DNA sequence: CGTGCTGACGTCAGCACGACG
DNA sequence: GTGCTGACGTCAGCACGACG
């Protein structure tokens, strides 16, 4: 019926990095926003046209970190994120190390199981990358026993509530289509995490149902690249 | 002199709890916002009357957690924070436990040293309460080696830019500097951001003051035992 | 009876390039 | 390389009611 059961926690995830998948990129900034199932069900369903941007739930756990990469950012990436290896290193940020894994483990162990990660284009980007960054380490994966889904597929599925042109599923395109405003704090880890949360809160009940149906273990995601 | 060196990181801190010091209160929500020295110094300079609310730095490590207490919130505490033991437990939030200490340790270890906490009224409330919660645990204090200060003291100091009986509550100071109300009132993160704005008013002066007044968190005495 | 139309489904070659930083 | 899409082959379902 439901592989793995009803998800008790969604953790909304977004990464910034040195560049794109060709480039064997490294993670520059990470954000996690953990929301319990109830919290999301209790989102208000008060929708005219346009419906207002849903207000985040009161109760939320959040983690936002900047990470020094082992290589420079592409000029392109450093433009759009507002980050650079020079600046992270003059500010004393660390690499993606075992210590960061211990942090992530403890954050996740505070969330009730089962537990699903949620990232826009996460099947192709955030989950492989993270998997690579984590395999490098001496510790055991903090993400073992955790599940994951991609919000593009979620929102594609959900826009079977209505047929014009074939339309974009980029984070921004979706937000604007649904709420008729520009989103904000673009290409900062937390900012896009909050945008993502807003689009998932559009139809909470339907989303959870779909997450429950399509959730798969993080341990099956294959690394973007190796060594 | 400068008793412990230049502080390389400021961690802005704020708690919500089940009540006030005469209850033996427990922590319900906790936010840490870590900003490097340089990131503070690179804040754009306040000018004009009022000056605009400074924009937070780009580079920031942030932690926000809700925590289930072992006892009920007071009616007053629940109203003002928007949190209640019932709601925290239906949502599966945990106690302040050994695992949370590990978490906090790892967060702090990611910050360059020396490192100072900053809390509004922390000398009387946040630091002792935190000290209390930590002493209950089987682990060592994650805050060994970390320093602390109170922002009420710093902001008193800094407002002898004028030459004079004001209120030094968080909202009073903000309204005084920026002529606006602050926004997400009595949510751990909200008031941390409001605190950061305050501290970004005269970034240089503040860091000077923090360097002179930072003291070890180990010397803070618990609220209760 | 067979014959032969129709609509549903799974497959695959061909085509336009998304969507992450 | 990915990820839609339309063309094609296949198959199950359905309509015929023919005759002495
Ligand atoms: Mg994204
Ligand atoms: Mg306070």
XYZ file of C-alpha atoms (C1' of nucleotides) and ligand atoms in Angstrom:
495
model
C 0.000 0.000 0.000
C 2.583 2.491 1.327
C 6.220 1.439 1.246
C 7.709 2.456 4.632
C 4.442 3.859 6.135
C 3.272 7.379 6.960
C 6.186 9.880 7.202
C 6.189 11.600 10.585
C 8.704 14.313 9.679
C 9.461 16.131 6.416
C 12.882 17.772 6.268
C 13.094 20.356 3.620
C 16.646 20.523 2.211
C 18.586 22.850 -0.095
C 22.269 23.118 -0.921
C 24.473 25.699 -2.484
C 27.687 24.561 -4.241
C 30.853 25.393 -6.239
C 29.169 24.633 -9.575
C 27.139 22.089 -11.545
C 27.269 18.203 -11.884
C 29.884 18.178 -14.712
C 32.274 20.020 -12.352
C 32.451 17.506 -9.461
C 31.121 20.274 -7.244
C 31.465 20.769 -3.521
C 28.894 22.022 -1.049
C 29.233 25.672 0.062
C 26.110 26.109 2.245
C 23.493 23.711 3.722
C 19.999 24.287 5.168
C 17.579 21.913 6.892
C 14.042 22.737 7.930
C 12.244 19.907 9.759
C 8.465 19.997 9.991
C 6.305 17.449 11.761
C 3.361 15.880 9.861
C 0.668 17.500 12.015
C 2.298 20.919 11.651
C 1.915 20.664 7.921
C -1.669 19.171 8.059
C -2.688 22.096 10.330
C -1.585 24.639 7.621
C -4.662 26.791 6.860
C -6.672 25.987 3.743
C -7.984 29.529 2.972
C -7.591 30.027 -0.801
C -9.104 32.699 -3.094
C -7.341 33.871 -6.251
C -4.522 34.396 -5.681
C -4.221 32.469 -2.436
C -1.932 34.133 0.120
C 1.508 32.676 0.694
C 1.031 30.187 3.576
C 2.612 31.222 6.839
C 5.248 28.770 8.096
C 4.261 26.645 11.117
C 5.087 27.823 14.607
C 6.936 24.643 15.452
C 9.964 24.013 13.262
C 13.576 22.852 13.675
C 16.099 24.620 11.467
C 19.785 24.296 10.636
C 21.736 26.689 8.384
C 25.479 26.262 7.796
C 28.206 27.642 5.611
C 30.851 25.184 4.532
C 34.336 25.905 3.092
C 34.910 23.932 -0.118
C 38.240 22.368 -1.166
C 38.228 24.147 -4.514
C 37.121 27.519 -5.900
C 33.592 28.345 -7.048
C 32.899 29.017 -10.656
C 32.443 32.766 -11.346
C 28.880 31.793 -12.273
C 28.164 30.047 -8.969
C 29.907 32.742 -6.870
C 27.783 35.433 -8.565
C 24.392 33.889 -7.969
C 24.995 32.551 -4.391
C 26.907 35.553 -3.084
C 29.494 33.144 -1.632
C 33.175 32.484 -2.431
C 35.944 30.184 -1.113
C 38.127 33.191 -0.305
C 35.435 34.716 1.894
C 34.384 31.496 3.633
C 38.058 30.865 4.501
C 38.766 34.357 5.855
C 35.643 33.761 8.020
C 37.024 30.469 9.408
C 34.413 28.109 7.989
C 35.370 24.451 7.959
C 35.284 21.703 5.389
C 32.573 19.090 5.146
C 34.108 16.953 7.972
C 33.173 14.173 10.488
C 32.153 16.883 12.929
C 29.540 18.148 10.495
C 28.294 14.585 10.143
C 27.901 14.329 13.953
C 25.836 17.550 13.896
C 23.566 16.276 11.119
C 23.052 12.962 12.847
C 22.008 14.657 16.081
C 19.667 17.032 14.251
C 17.980 14.081 12.559
C 17.789 12.004 15.713
C 15.629 14.837 17.175
C 12.968 14.199 14.504
C 10.428 11.404 14.929
C 10.684 8.506 12.446
C 9.996 7.741 9.732
C 11.549 10.797 8.209
C 11.728 12.000 4.614
C 14.040 14.534 2.990
C 12.523 16.947 0.452
C 14.578 18.875 -2.102
C 13.773 20.562 -5.362
C 15.502 18.559 -8.096
C 16.987 16.494 -5.264
C 17.103 13.181 -7.200
C 19.444 14.822 -9.723
C 21.326 17.316 -7.513
C 21.146 17.628 -3.749
C 20.861 13.943 -2.801
C 23.683 12.583 -5.038
C 25.965 15.449 -4.023
C 25.280 14.930 -0.348
C 25.805 11.209 -0.742
C 29.253 11.870 -2.277
C 30.260 14.384 0.385
C 29.227 11.866 3.081
C 30.860 8.729 1.603
C 34.251 10.553 1.825
C 33.970 10.517 5.662
C 35.146 8.000 8.284
C 31.788 8.002 10.203
C 28.657 6.001 9.289
C 26.041 7.891 7.255
C 23.869 10.168 9.369
C 21.225 9.649 6.713
C 20.850 5.835 6.965
C 17.208 4.944 7.723
C 16.066 8.285 6.274
C 13.897 8.476 3.161
C 13.801 11.039 0.353
C 11.625 12.508 -2.428
C 11.941 15.167 -5.157
C 9.523 18.090 -5.019
C 9.451 18.531 -8.832
C 7.692 15.165 -9.223
C 5.451 16.063 -6.225
C 4.346 19.346 -7.718
C 4.005 17.892 -11.254
C 1.688 15.274 -9.807
C -0.239 17.952 -7.857
C -0.794 20.155 -10.954
C -3.117 17.371 -12.182
C -5.823 19.494 -10.438
C -6.290 21.120 -13.884
C -3.816 22.160 -19.882
C -2.377 25.295 -21.536
C 1.295 25.323 -22.545
C 3.895 22.973 -21.022
C 5.074 24.963 -18.020
C 8.276 25.160 -15.955
C 8.879 23.418 -12.638
C 11.831 25.533 -11.575
C 11.413 26.581 -7.964
C 10.580 30.194 -8.927
C 8.276 29.450 -11.858
C 6.126 27.276 -9.601
C 6.016 29.796 -6.752
C 5.012 32.609 -9.054
C 2.453 30.419 -10.898
C 0.800 29.471 -7.573
C 1.045 32.765 -5.633
C 1.561 35.477 -8.308
C 4.492 37.132 -6.563
C 8.234 36.948 -6.970
C 9.916 34.855 -4.222
C 12.769 36.268 -2.124
C 16.326 35.746 -0.887
C 17.098 33.819 -4.083
C 19.999 31.344 -4.216
C 20.680 31.424 -0.489
C 20.235 28.027 1.040
C 17.632 29.053 3.606
C 15.772 31.421 1.332
C 15.060 28.755 -1.288
C 14.261 26.285 1.501
C 11.522 28.688 2.654
C 10.191 29.163 -0.929
C 10.118 25.367 -1.248
C 8.241 25.029 2.024
C 5.681 27.552 0.710
C 5.004 25.570 -2.479
C 4.706 22.319 -0.494
C 2.208 24.054 1.867
C -0.089 24.909 -1.126
C -1.928 21.581 -0.813
C -0.531 19.963 2.393
C -2.869 16.937 2.612
C -2.186 15.970 -1.042
C 1.552 16.427 -0.713
C 1.849 14.172 2.341
C -0.211 11.487 0.618
C 2.168 11.659 -2.383
C 5.295 11.742 -0.197
C 3.993 8.660 1.600
C 3.511 6.953 -1.769
C 6.876 7.820 -3.354
C 9.323 8.043 -0.424
C 12.516 5.991 -1.006
C 15.553 5.336 1.224
C 18.412 7.738 1.044
C 20.791 4.748 1.201
C 19.751 3.847 -2.434
C 20.741 7.253 -3.926
C 23.943 6.883 -5.908
C 26.745 9.455 -5.528
C 27.095 12.229 -8.121
C 30.806 11.246 -8.334
C 33.551 9.149 -6.628
C 37.306 9.308 -5.926
C 44.133 44.692 28.603
C 41.854 42.166 26.776
C 41.436 39.203 29.157
C 40.775 36.440 26.508
C 41.794 37.953 23.163
C 39.731 39.210 20.255
C 36.531 37.206 19.906
C 36.487 35.583 16.470
C 32.842 34.500 16.629
C 29.750 36.025 18.177
C 26.903 33.621 18.767
C 23.711 35.491 19.329
C 21.388 33.455 21.611
C 17.770 33.462 22.836
C 15.557 31.071 24.810
C 11.885 30.589 25.349
C 10.847 28.657 28.463
C 7.871 27.514 30.575
C 7.912 30.634 32.771
C 9.920 32.998 34.918
C 12.851 32.384 37.381
C 10.700 31.809 40.522
C 8.984 28.864 38.753
C 11.846 26.519 38.066
C 11.381 26.922 34.374
C 12.509 24.676 31.511
C 13.478 25.534 27.990
C 10.920 25.165 25.256
C 12.762 26.761 22.269
C 16.405 27.711 21.562
C 18.015 29.712 18.754
C 21.719 30.245 18.057
C 22.928 32.564 15.350
C 26.679 32.503 14.751
C 28.386 35.426 13.031
C 32.103 35.798 12.407
C 33.982 38.925 13.465
C 34.764 40.049 9.934
C 31.114 39.507 8.885
C 30.077 41.932 11.605
C 32.801 44.505 10.758
C 31.747 44.356 7.065
C 28.229 45.651 8.104
C 27.407 48.916 6.293
C 27.752 52.036 8.444
C 24.703 53.554 10.213
C 23.969 57.181 9.143
C 20.958 59.520 8.958
C 18.098 59.786 11.490
C 16.859 57.187 11.898
C 19.309 54.900 10.115
C 17.828 51.896 8.271
C 17.724 48.522 9.926
C 21.029 46.861 8.893
C 20.765 43.856 6.640
C 22.078 40.609 8.187
C 25.427 39.337 6.857
C 25.449 36.811 4.045
C 27.568 34.301 5.980
C 25.821 33.022 9.119
C 25.403 29.652 10.829
C 21.923 29.322 12.335
C 20.288 26.758 14.651
C 16.620 26.774 15.827
C 15.107 23.923 17.833
C 11.865 23.380 19.697
C 12.210 21.368 22.871
C 9.617 19.521 24.975
C 9.739 20.547 28.621
C 9.085 18.208 31.584
C 6.328 20.439 32.984
C 3.589 22.696 31.746
C 4.071 26.194 30.528
C 2.426 28.896 32.538
C -0.681 30.459 30.934
C 1.309 33.674 30.492
C 4.321 31.936 28.967
C 2.155 29.927 26.493
C 0.259 33.011 25.345
C 3.258 35.135 24.595
C 5.456 32.419 22.903
C 2.750 30.487 21.020
C 4.074 27.175 22.420
C 2.632 24.587 24.825
C 3.817 21.258 26.269
C 0.780 19.554 24.722
C 1.632 20.790 21.242
C 5.337 20.031 21.539
C 4.635 16.429 22.549
C 2.005 15.664 19.942
C 4.662 16.870 17.393
C 7.220 14.475 18.912
C 9.697 17.069 20.196
C 12.277 15.722 22.583
C 13.573 16.672 25.981
C 16.673 18.626 26.593
C 18.850 15.484 26.458
C 22.411 14.162 25.977
C 21.749 14.094 22.268
C 20.929 17.834 22.237
C 24.233 18.511 23.989
C 26.112 16.614 21.288
C 24.293 18.690 18.681
C 25.207 21.966 20.381
C 28.779 20.844 20.809
C 29.100 20.116 17.108
C 27.511 23.409 16.138
C 29.951 25.311 18.358
C 33.015 23.352 17.224
C 32.302 24.616 13.663
C 32.959 28.165 14.919
C 36.483 29.635 15.173
C 37.723 30.511 18.617
C 37.712 32.417 20.769
C 33.960 32.428 20.806
C 31.500 34.536 22.880
C 27.745 34.042 23.499
C 25.509 37.110 23.387
C 22.056 37.109 24.991
C 19.692 39.925 26.012
C 19.423 39.739 29.771
C 21.547 36.606 29.619
C 23.433 37.241 32.853
C 20.109 36.992 34.738
C 18.062 34.624 32.557
C 19.389 32.735 29.533
C 22.831 31.826 30.724
C 21.796 30.515 34.163
C 18.856 28.596 32.741
C 21.047 27.060 30.104
C 23.597 26.230 32.786
C 20.818 24.501 34.760
C 19.550 22.430 31.817
C 23.106 21.283 30.966
C 24.113 20.306 34.503
C 21.271 17.743 34.533
C 22.929 15.799 31.689
C 25.479 13.016 31.864
C 27.766 14.711 29.297
C 30.347 17.457 29.773
C 29.201 21.026 29.031
C 29.321 21.769 25.292
C 30.050 25.362 26.312
C 33.451 24.631 28.025
C 35.894 27.110 26.459
C 33.121 29.460 25.304
C 32.773 33.004 26.633
C 29.690 35.128 27.242
C 28.319 38.674 27.586
C 25.046 40.560 28.088
C 23.803 42.859 25.341
C 21.906 45.119 27.797
C 25.294 46.139 29.273
C 26.913 46.647 25.818
C 24.024 48.795 24.572
C 24.011 50.910 27.750
C 27.730 51.464 27.134
C 27.239 52.306 23.487
C 24.478 54.897 24.099
C 27.030 57.243 25.685
C 27.557 58.321 22.059
C 25.018 60.890 23.370
C 25.747 62.808 26.668
C 22.913 62.518 29.300
C 16.200 56.948 32.464
C 15.575 54.852 29.323
C 14.288 51.230 29.052
C 16.837 48.647 27.892
C 14.294 45.959 26.995
C 14.855 44.465 23.506
C 11.948 46.281 21.785
C 12.625 49.636 23.470
C 16.236 49.663 22.216
C 15.187 48.713 18.664
C 12.412 51.308 18.509
C 14.926 53.845 19.897
C 17.572 53.160 17.230
C 15.390 52.431 14.204
C 11.909 53.997 14.888
C 10.027 50.875 13.931
C 8.460 48.032 15.832
C 10.387 44.682 15.730
C 8.431 41.803 14.214
C 8.329 38.086 15.242
C 7.994 38.879 18.923
C 8.749 36.110 21.477
C 9.754 33.439 19.012
C 13.332 32.367 19.731
C 14.556 33.171 16.254
C 12.558 36.376 15.883
C 14.109 38.022 18.931
C 17.621 36.735 18.012
C 17.319 38.576 14.686
C 16.073 41.675 16.483
C 19.094 41.306 18.804
C 21.472 41.030 15.835
C 20.059 44.176 14.311
C 20.737 45.964 17.590
C 24.278 44.696 17.700
C 24.871 45.729 14.046
C 24.151 49.424 14.886
C 27.795 50.242 15.689
C 29.610 46.984 14.844
C 33.150 48.210 15.768
C 32.219 49.715 19.122
C 30.352 46.529 20.056
C 33.234 44.169 19.282
C 35.538 46.419 21.276
C 33.147 46.198 24.209
C 32.629 42.413 23.889
C 36.376 41.815 23.841
C 36.780 43.792 27.060
C 33.823 42.127 28.869
C 33.718 38.499 27.635
C 33.969 35.987 30.482
C 33.878 32.141 30.543
C 30.491 30.478 30.453
C 31.857 27.999 33.064
C 31.660 30.873 35.685
C 27.898 31.486 35.210
C 25.988 29.992 38.192
C 22.853 27.908 37.515
C 19.406 29.400 37.965
C 18.423 26.505 40.286
C 19.521 22.957 41.305
C -18.973 -17.791 -37.086
C -15.386 -15.330 -38.659
C -13.918 -10.418 -39.718
C -12.456 -5.915 -38.732
C -13.149 -1.576 -36.158
C -11.801 0.841 -31.885
C -9.525 2.331 -27.729
C -5.975 1.263 -24.012
C -1.436 0.221 -23.020
C 3.833 -0.558 -23.313
C 7.566 0.256 -26.053
C 11.065 2.876 -28.405
C 13.206 5.986 -31.622
C 13.635 10.788 -32.264
C 13.740 15.507 -30.554
C 14.202 19.815 -27.599
C 16.957 21.054 -24.295
C 15.238 21.437 -18.582
C 16.984 22.658 -13.955
C 20.336 22.120 -10.014
C 24.560 25.749 -8.757
C 23.009 12.955 -20.948
C 17.658 13.709 -19.667
C 12.734 13.637 -20.311
C 8.680 14.531 -22.949
C 5.931 12.800 -27.114
C 3.933 10.602 -30.903
C 3.934 6.233 -33.908
C 3.488 1.636 -33.987
C 2.122 -3.398 -32.741
C -0.648 -5.839 -29.794
C -4.631 -7.227 -27.604
C -9.133 -7.261 -25.297
C -13.865 -5.797 -26.196
C -17.719 -5.181 -29.246
C -21.159 -5.475 -33.426
C -22.665 -8.005 -36.944
C -27.442 -11.979 -37.047
C -26.197 -12.791 -43.295
C -28.926 -19.075 -43.423
C -33.336 -23.043 -44.818
Mg 17.193 24.255 -5.318
Mg 15.287 36.881 25.752
